[PDB]
Point group: C5
């Protein structure tokens, strides 16, 4: 695993091939989680930010930007969306969390909580996933779609198997996240497939 | 007598079912009142904020958001509307007061007074009401309407039987409201029906 | 007379009836005046702010709002209009002076001078007026029109029989005006007709 | 030879008659010049700011406002235009210099240089002009067009027979211009024709 | 061999004729480079900023403005585009760098990094070029197109054969660039063709 501190992955072009696989030893179904990352894209169409599919299950966990000012979260093929005021183009810091017990999804955009939404109360996002950055999956590992691909830069990705309270979200936003135990930018196991480059993070 | 301070009700989805009943043994008609609460919603359509119906009387006392920037208050099926410059989406603090002798209705949005309007001078809003949050009543406890439903977060809801002066409006807005006698967020009696969750107030 | 310091007239609804008659023993024709007052309305339509008619003369002195950012002044049925940048809805402090010898009308809106316009050079606005607030006269004391009626709040109304220099405009603006001889909010003689209420001025 | 220090001219209404003739014993052709003045108008339509015609030559030197954010300069009937961000309505300080040898025209708006443009390299602006304020000339001293009329206030008009450095533009803008030798607000020879008043300058 | 510190090239008119040839004795092909300059123009149409052509190859290296907020880079006839929030009209400081090994193109507008794009990885941009300012070349030295001409001012043009780190971009934006070895505004070799004047830089 690699230390990607002060670095980002830049997907420099639109394609249906370019993507990087994120590898975690996830054995037990997710009950809770929080996923934070930074992104910088000047795409005005919709795209996938983070895809997570399991054997025979599409959009098990998907974080999707519909358009400017609105973000969607998919849990077990059901989705929820929340709006926010934001500049275009501009770098963005995103956290989203979800708990199975209340069904509540929480988005934070640049430190700022959006309205809470709920979906899939009492569900478990299954284990042994295929997580990819740069493309939206429609099979376990594949069936990409050029019109949902992400082109730009992603950095500082962390994923925890708990719902973080606001002070921890805020730490991540401001550059000091707690060590994450599902995905950690500072000890990341990834595969680059296609044309993606690691360049220093110069937009924060 | 449940102390909900630091907490909100979240209506996580749209429906004609989810709602909470606020219970108060109000037996004597209202001549004067002030009602304050916070809300957080990214609905663009019209929605009911606070629905107070009595036996055989619709919209006995209703706070309604028409659209961004525009609030309505119904007293005894009569309605007055006032505008304010507003950001969307954004959390809001709302007080409204009414007094029978003058008929004057006073809106205070995030500490700013809207233009006074007047209605129902000399009228007394009936007692023994059925107060619902999340849905808009068209009967005495029911006849809900999906497109007037409220999905978002409501907290810090206080109802007094007098018209509060500006400094007490400001105190409520600031987070130190005077104890209330009709409805008090710190000693509230309610019933949750459907899918509504109590979460901490993270957006203030 | 009555001291209205710290109070405002609330015209709480649209009507063809509610209005207030300002009384001044004005016996000499006016060659110079300035008129200052504060107003708070969320009306989008055109409205009359201050209507001054004499025997056989309509619109002898009319201060009229065409639309947001557009104020008009009528002198002996003649009219000029001047534009300002302004927010809607917002409280506004207005002064306007008019000089017979030059014909020049000055508007000051929240302390800012508008572009000077000119009308009726050498005219004298006739005495013994009927002055009304809340409605636009078409006769000597009446002939109101619902669609030019004022809904909202007026206060801190003063009228001088001279043209005030800028510094006396700013004083009025910041809350310490020169005692007026034609109309003074702190020594006012008025009749309320219809639904109009007096309330503390909570928005300045 | 009137000191108009602290005064402006105010064209209080739209007409085809009102104007001021500016008088100068300009008996040799211009190779370079700088023209500065302040203006306050709420006209949305196009309008002449400064009209300089010679015998048999229309639009010899004309400073024309096309619309908000767009100023034009005519030199010997050739036109050039530069844009700027500006508020409306609002007072503006304007300065335009032209240089025969290069053809370079520079606009400064409220101290801000616009993009330089070029016209009529090698040309000399003919002497013995008629210069009018308030109308646009199509003939030597006349043929005005009401839809090009200036309604508003002008003052602090100075004209030099050299191109001023930015230092001296900044100084003019700040209220201390260099003594001018074609046209000088503090030693101005003019004829008022029609309805134009002189009033103190209250908006800078 | 001229030192243009505090000076600028102004293209005052639209045409298909006026341009400046920059001469650089570039013998090797380029793998890395950085090109910075300031430009001030109020064209709303597309225009070429910097045109670099070689024997038989169109758009070997072209910086092109598509419309307000949109900048294009051509390397060997492939093209990438990146967007920024931008005021119009207003001066701008542009840097762009490109790296063969990764294909990564970096735009920096007013010291702010745009989203990275990638093109032509493994490619070497050809030497012995013909570089022109004001026009967009379509042959080696010529075939100019009036609707891509640049009319405005360009100054402080530096070209390095390395990829500058953000520190050196900023110091170049802030008025103290590193000495440049492919093009250097302080030791520039150029030819003027047509109407293009040299004047002091006043908009910085
Ligand atoms: Ca999918
Ligand atoms: Ca798909
Ligand atoms: Ca109802
Ligand atoms: Ca209903
Ligand atoms: Ca009338
Ligand atoms: Ca009328
Ligand atoms: Ca003409
Ligand atoms: Ca004309
Ligand atoms: Ca080309
Ligand atoms: Ca071309």
């Amino acid at each position: 695993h690699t230390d990607l501190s002060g670095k980002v992955f830049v997907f420099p072009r639109e394609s249906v091939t370019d993507h990087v696989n994120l590898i975690t030893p996830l054995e037990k179904p997710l009950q809770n989680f929080t996923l934070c990352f930074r992104a910088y894209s000047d795409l005005s169409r919709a795209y996938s930010l983070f895809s997570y599919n399991t054997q025979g299950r599409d959009n098990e966990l998907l974080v999707y930007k519909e358009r400017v000012g609105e973000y969607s979260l998919y849990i077990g093929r059901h989705k929820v969306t929340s709006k926010v005021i934001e500049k275009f183009p501009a770098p963005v810091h995103i956290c989203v969390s979800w708990e199975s017990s209340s069904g509540i999804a929480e988005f934070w955009i640049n430190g700022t909580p959006l309205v809470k939404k709920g979906l899939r109360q009492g569900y478990f996002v299954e284990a042994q996933p295929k997580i990819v950055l740069g493309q939206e999956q429609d099979s376990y590992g594949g069936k990409f779609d050029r019109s949902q691909s992400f082109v730009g830069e992603i950095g500082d990705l962390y994923m925890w198997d708990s719902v973080l309270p606001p002070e921890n979200i805020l730490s991540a936003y401001q550059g000091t996240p707690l060590p994450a135990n599902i995905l950690d930018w500072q000890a990341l196991n990834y595969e680059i497939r296609g044309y993606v480059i690691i360049k220093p993070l110069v937009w924060v």
